[PDB]
Design a binder for these strands. Sequence first.
RNA 1: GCC
Length: 553
Amino acid sequence: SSMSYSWTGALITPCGPEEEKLPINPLSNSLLRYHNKVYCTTSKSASQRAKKVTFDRTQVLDAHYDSVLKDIKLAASKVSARLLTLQQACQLTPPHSARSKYGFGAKEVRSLSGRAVNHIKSVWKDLLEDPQTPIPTTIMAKNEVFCVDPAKGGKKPARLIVYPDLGVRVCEKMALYDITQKLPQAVMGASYGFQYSPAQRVEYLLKAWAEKKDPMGFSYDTRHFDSTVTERDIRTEESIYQACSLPEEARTAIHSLTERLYVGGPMFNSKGQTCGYRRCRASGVLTTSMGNTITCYVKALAACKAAGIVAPTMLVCGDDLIVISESQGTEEDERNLRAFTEAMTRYSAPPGDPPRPEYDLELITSCSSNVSVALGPRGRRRYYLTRDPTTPLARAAWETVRHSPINSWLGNIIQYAPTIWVRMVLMTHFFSILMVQDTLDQNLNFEMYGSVYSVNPLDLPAIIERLHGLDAFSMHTYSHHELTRVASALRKLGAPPLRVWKSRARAVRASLISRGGKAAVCGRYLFNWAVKTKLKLTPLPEARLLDLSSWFT
RNA sequence: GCC
Ligand SMILES: Nc1ccn([C@@H]2O[C@H](COP(=O)(O)OP(=O)(O)O)[C@@H](O)[C@H]2O)c(=O)n1
Ligand SMILES: [Cl-]
Ligand SMILES: [Mn+2]
Ligand SMILES: [Mn+2]
Ligand SMILES: [Mn+2]
């Protein structure tokens, strides 16, 4: 049937300058040495990406799908959702959002300037009146940082981002923001992934694992998911939205947004030229996460049913999927997973790597992360979330005139505090840098799901206790997989090995202790792993007085 | 670019 894209041959041009690394990286050249391996994806590679995502979709649904969609619509119908005022929507626009072509930006939008509010009213009127004219979008290459991998062909090409003008983005929120806050949870319940912190993700996967008489687990990811999403998938997303009770004005805007924007349209580069035409998901519109997550849930749950997965418990995050089910023996389990993949492929959600049954929770990876296990202060097993540190290490070394990597360090320290690589490497480096800068008590921003939170380094111990438990400060005897992977990643980026970080950590610890105050608590709590005379660590008062629930919505 |  449909191509995902067509192209005019016009290039995908840059936003402005694409930052160069420098001959000296003063914040990160004591963390690792192989700076050559660390690179940013640029618009030069946008052509290579285009080729790899332009292809013809043919989708074939069936009774399992139909049955699943039916049940999801019913679940949707228990949701009521409101329009947002034009003003509420303006004020959910992030502070640095790309400016409009009509001479105003996000500052004006957030402060409700008259010009801006005016334009947005006209845009909304035109949405309510015209349910048809395709709405033009800009296409840009995303800039992300990775570590070169020769096993996977050198350097990844940039992914493509497609979005409408700022004025339309605000209208999207008016129509659909309230739904994005409610529909996912209503349709998927406990399966909805973005509701959990690391420790909760872990606790959920463990409960799920323990409930089975004889468990089996697998993970799934769709190759180039946005480009596999069909016009029909998108219209089916509308039906799911429409199954909620909504003021009629929302219904009309939602429908018009679907037909003029979501199902497809023309794409312009940043130089203004016509670039191509799209008949798949624009990753850039408001409904990108909600849609990806819901359409993935629909297909996946259908696939489980097509393939005989018994007693599936799921966890879904965009196109990333884990299912833990009752094993039917390894012979049947392997056949079933092939059926699953076959069904998903029919549903136009083909895999990057074919999935595989597993029978040990450590070997299942999803959202680039996995559960692992260590021993706690009293010798009991302690389960926690970790990941390959390669990319976090690479981003820890992205330093330019306009980008400091310190926020990156902080974000990882908080998400992955119980990991051996955060504790020994990133924490040691982070504290060492800030002490020498004398900026320990200065606040930093922590980025997560589009939100930023001001955090003070001297509060890490409390935040960590709240978020991960007091055991995060006392875990030992990490697993073989985990020690192997960390050693290997440090070697690959030319970073000192763990032994050395242990020395550096003893020094950082002592400096912190000698400053007394909150700094000394950082020294005792965060670096107790680093000394022979291991102190007794007690619950922190400041911790009890703390609410971090919004951090992981 | 969006959650
Ligand atoms: N920076 C990102 C990354 C992913 N995504 C969305 O999530 C989808 C799945 O992402 P992924 O990480 O599995 O990579 P692909 O499946 O795109 O190759 C993408 O196709 C996008 O629609 C996004 O909107 N922005
Ligand atoms: Cl313990
Ligand atoms: Mn994918
Ligand atoms: Mn409609
Ligand atoms: Mn994915």
